[PDB]
Design a protein around this motif. Structure first.
Motif, PDB file in Angstrom:
ATOM      1  N   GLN F 106      13.698  19.350  16.573  1.00  0.00           N
ATOM      2  CA  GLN F 106      14.340  18.643  17.674  1.00  0.00           C
ATOM      3  C   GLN F 106      13.314  17.917  18.540  1.00  0.00           C
ATOM      4  O   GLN F 106      13.168  18.230  19.725  1.00  0.00           O
ATOM      5  N   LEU F 107      12.605  16.951  17.961  1.00  0.00           N
ATOM      6  CA  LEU F 107      11.640  16.132  18.689  1.00  0.00           C
ATOM      7  C   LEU F 107      10.534  16.971  19.324  1.00  0.00           C
ATOM      8  O   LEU F 107      10.109  16.692  20.448  1.00  0.00           O
ATOM      9  N   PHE F 108      10.070  18.004  18.629  1.00  0.00           N
ATOM     10  CA  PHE F 108       8.927  18.786  19.093  1.00  0.00           C
ATOM     11  C   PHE F 108       7.652  18.063  18.682  1.00  0.00           C
ATOM     12  O   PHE F 108       7.200  18.173  17.544  1.00  0.00           O
ATOM     13  N   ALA F 109       7.067  17.314  19.613  1.00  0.00           N
ATOM     14  CA  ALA F 109       5.880  16.533  19.302  1.00  0.00           C
ATOM     15  C   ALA F 109       4.757  17.441  18.821  1.00  0.00           C
ATOM     16  O   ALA F 109       4.437  18.447  19.460  1.00  0.00           O
ATOM     17  N   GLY F 110       4.165  17.085  17.683  1.00  0.00           N
ATOM     18  CA  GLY F 110       3.080  17.857  17.118  1.00  0.00           C
ATOM     19  C   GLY F 110       1.714  17.340  17.511  1.00  0.00           C
ATOM     20  O   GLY F 110       0.876  18.097  18.003  1.00  0.00           O
ATOM     21  N   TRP F 111       1.475  16.049  17.293  1.00  0.00           N
ATOM     22  CA  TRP F 111       0.186  15.444  17.596  1.00  0.00           C
ATOM     23  C   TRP F 111       0.275  13.952  17.314  1.00  0.00           C
ATOM     24  O   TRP F 111       1.246  13.470  16.730  1.00  0.00           O
TER      25      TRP F 111
END
Lengths: 112, 222, 184, 47, 124, 184, 74, 112, 47
Positions: F106-111
């Motif tokens: 759900q749009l969990f920004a990684g990098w």
């Protein structure tokens, strides 16, 4: 302004006919009301499900009905006319409208 | 397997395909064999592809390249003209799936039927190849039925379908989903596309009729 | 086996992902464009089904190449990419080149990394040194202050202990921590 | 609604006028006033 | 186990910036669609490690960044290039700077050597 | 069209992926934090449905930035990132900032990557040279041994043939392969 | 047998085992609490005999074991 | 120009037969009309669902029907002939067309 | 089909020969020739 015939109408004579037609790939709803004292058809034009009609006018022979209204995004750009098939002196009546009843209501579309 | 049906003087091809399933149950008095047949199921579900193209390629070339991969006769196709790709494209997996995706973005209908590949454009239709009337063995009056089980939001491509009708007739295998029919009844009159067919039959007991789902058209007369 | 209602959805979902939902894949560069850096990638992986059928990825055109850069592209480490370099590939969710496409994850190339050291091309790595190297030109910085520029006929080292030893085959120049200056 | 509007001139049927005037009469003498068939007021108003 | 590591490199691996990776470094991981080590696997996305990035600066290990400078740095050896021409090599006992204005100031604790823009050459 | 039982699942799966399963996307930096490097990303891609409706990604906050580094962060190439730089974005499977979230993808920004050279910002690349460059300071290493530091008023080149030519506008110092030492 | 590549397993154990079945021709299925791991195609004695004495009901009939047909190398 | 026989036709004698056939993996629709005064069959060939037929010609024995039309993308490249099985002097009739009725209408395809 | 082939020597049944020769006779005298049961030609050909 080249134009080509592309649609014809017929009326059953019922004084409050209402039906939907498709012209130039767009769809419109039409209402026809018969006037007793003036013995003439009143036509109302508007969008599908519109609260009020966009155009209302009285039908007559050899008169360009849409002439003063080709400046709206919801009005056909073609030509709508009523002309007779029989004697030229016959005026529009109640039951004499149709492809063979005496009066030919027709719509024609410009070539683009 | 091929199937034929008609009326005592001729039989028209009604289906042709492969036997997907078969089972037998023989409880006491009567055995009952069952079949499930697929129209080109094997080709549509195993024809792999691997193709790519660069910016500027004519779209008309991509269409022909993918269909030849599918390995089926071309029933009818409407080429794109001078259309050209706007971005680089790559295609893999089953060829049928890739073609069905190109349908959405270009307003074209793709569907195989009785071994023939049909590629047409939505909204437009082909002459009166069939006329329906009481003489033509019609069964009951036509009734208006929506062509889909759901409604879409509208701006109120506009050319797309969105309306239809239904009719029933005695069995007649010389009809296809992509054809065109003329409806000569006392209430409804006009031209319609075909969208769906269902053939039913009971030899000793049952109906011998066909049901057509018609869809209104608003495009050019291709 | 195929009787339960859930197994049908399991197989359908497994087959659906096979033809879509492309996320990442390895590849090798076959075509290189130096103006507006972009590379053509040929994915390496494939599978053979029991029915004697194979699945091959096609050649993918014009995948943008990333390099460590900033300040609006004014600072960048542009290394000399060549065809045949092994790189990893990423696919974008939507067709970033168009705004009308209805599909998603359909092999929309997002970008490519400079290089990945896999089996068969594994170059050695120095356990502790930041070495920036070219065909025969080497720049080595060691944690203990010392830095060195080397090439097959020159050497410029600056050691931790105030030592400068600019050297060459034809001679050398050096400075000692004691403030000496000499010319060899 | 049926008079002058932004799109020309329209025409009202009879029944709408009948209902409007009957509603006016209803308001005049409360909800109990009779206005159908047998009322003398009905015969006057419809005529 | 055994995720390949990417480094900026090219020319067939002849040019590469091999930094000294150590255990404990925080990195991001990517998974490949298919088992690139085998051609018969029937599954997809089943934890097939694709590759790993050198390092990612998240919370808890966020090192500071110079607002405007391309600094290549080691434990105690630093290489700094500034936009205004100046470049400098530094270490706790040596310094070799080449400034924009034709200044060379090769220096050391035991002495220094410099050249002025006016063409002077001196030995400290 | 919509009669088969399989087409319903096809459309349902196609629509399900539209609102979830975010994997990768391009973007542009609009907000930059220099302490604990992080950047705000504005995804560029979008689509317009036939019903006159549009889908826009929102601004994503605090995506960690990766740089080539090691040895516990003691060695790192910290380039000067600025707002407006075009970068590629990756989304993590799980909310790495929390351990109780029940959702996934759900749009969990990684990098985010340092920069990507796409159309409209494609800087030129040298066919064969490892050039580390700044606004006006350039470090060039060529495969044939030669290395050079340049700036608009200084030049320090060490060529393959034992040549050192430390130079400046006000003068120069050089050493020939023959061992000569001169001061200009 | 030995692994050819590094492997990692997470999630439900049953799902991971069912995946190992495909790539090694083995059948895995739990039943009345018992775990059964066998190999496809092969079979174990006559543990049961069916005949009119054994309370059979009607004659056997041939029925396909799956609702679809697979492509074959034939 | 090597050619191999690959299809044969039959007619029931109905004066307005129309049916679909597949040749060279492509599909076409055919119409046959019987002429009273000229006692001959008129054949029309076209694509499936086409507005108008592509080719119309009169059938005769030992005459290459498609000869002047092998330059269109929707016309078979093979050979279409009518030759008799009985006495060579028999000309095409209404009911005498078929594999055993006396006249053998046949299509043959070149080898590629 | 039943004579010499690429895989040895085969054997034809009676009915195939009967049908082949009856087809030949049919071609000889058109589709109207009778060849079943009551035909003298049938009794000669089958024997």
């Amino acid at each position: 302004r080249t134009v080509v015939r592309t649609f014809d109408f017929e009326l059953s004579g019922y004084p409050d006919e209402t039906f939907r037609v498709v012209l130039d790939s767009v769809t419109y709803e039409l209402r026809f009301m018969w006037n007793e004292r003036d013995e003439s058809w009143f036509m109302s034009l508007g969008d599908i499900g519109a609260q009020r009609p966009t155009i209302t006018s009285k039908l007559t022979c050899y008169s360009d009905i849409l002439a003063p209204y080709r400046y709206l995004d919801n009005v056909p750009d073609g030509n709508l006319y009523l002309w007779p098939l029989g004697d030229i002196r016959t005026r529009a009546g109640r039951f004499n409208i149709g492809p063979l009843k005496g009066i030919q209501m027709t719509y024609s579309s410009l070539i683009e | 397997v091929m199937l034929h049906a008609g009326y005592n003087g001729d039989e028209k091809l009604i289906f042709s395909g492969t036997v997907e399933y078969v089972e037998d149950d023989f409880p006491e008095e009567t055995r009952t064999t069952k079949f499930i047949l697929g129209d080109g199921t094997l080709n549509l579900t195993t024809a792999t592809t691997a193709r790519s193209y660069r910016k500027g390629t004519p779209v008309n070339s991509v269409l022909n390249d993918l269909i030849a991969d599918l390995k089926l006769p071309k029933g009818r196709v409407i080429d794109f003209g001078n259309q050209t790709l706007q971005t680089s494209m790559a295609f893999t997996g089953n060829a049928s799936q890739n073609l069905a995706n190109l349908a959405k973005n270009t307003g074209s209908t793709f569907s195989v039927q009785d071994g023939a590949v049909y590629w047409t454009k939505e909204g437009s239709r082909f002459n009166v190849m069939f006329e329906i009337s009481e003489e033509g063995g019609m069964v009951g009056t036509p009734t208006p039925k929506q062509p889909s089980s759901s409604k879409k939001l509208i701006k109120a491509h506009d050319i797309k379908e969105d309306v239809g009708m239904t009719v029933s007739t005695l069995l007649n295998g010389a009809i296809l989903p992509e054809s065109t029919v003329y409806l000569n009844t006392r209430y409804h009159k006009g031209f319609y596309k075909v969208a769906e067919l269902t053939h039913r039959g009971g030899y000793e007991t049952g109906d011998w009729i066909t049901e057509l789902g018609l869809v209104e058209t608003r495009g050019e007369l291709i | 086996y195929a009787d339960r209602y859930d197994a049908a959805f399991g197989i359908y979902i497994s087959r659906f992902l096979r033809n879509n939902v492309h996320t990442n894949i390895r590849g090798k560069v076959v075509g290189v464009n130096y103006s507006g850096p972009s590379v053509d990638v040929q994915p390496m992986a494939y599978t053979e089904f029991p029915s004697g059928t194979t699945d091959r990825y096609p050649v993918i055109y014009d995948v943008p190449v990333l390099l460590p850069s900033g300040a609006g592209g004014k600072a960048r480490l542009t290394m000399p990419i060549k065809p045949g370099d092994v790189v990893g590939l990423s696919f974008s969710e939507r067709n970033e080149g168009d705004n009308n496409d209805q599909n998603t994850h359909q092999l929309f190339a997002g970008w490519a990394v400079t290089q990945i050291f896999t089996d068969g091309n594994s170059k050695a790595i120095h356990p502790d040194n930041v070495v920036l190297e070219n065909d025969k030109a080497i720049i080595t910085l060691k944690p203990d202050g010392d830095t060195s520029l080397q090439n097959p006929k020159v050497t410029v080292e600056a050691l931790a202990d105030g030592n400068v030893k600019i050297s060459n085959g034809t001679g050398e120049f050096t400075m000692s921590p004691s403030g000496e200056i000499k010319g060899g | 609604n049926y008079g002058l509007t932004g799109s020309g001139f329209n025409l009202p049927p009879m029944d709408d006028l009948v209902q409007e005037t009957k509603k006016t009469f209803k308001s005049a003498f409360g909800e109990d006033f009779n206005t159908e068939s047998n009322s003398v007021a009905d015969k006057l108003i419809q005529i």
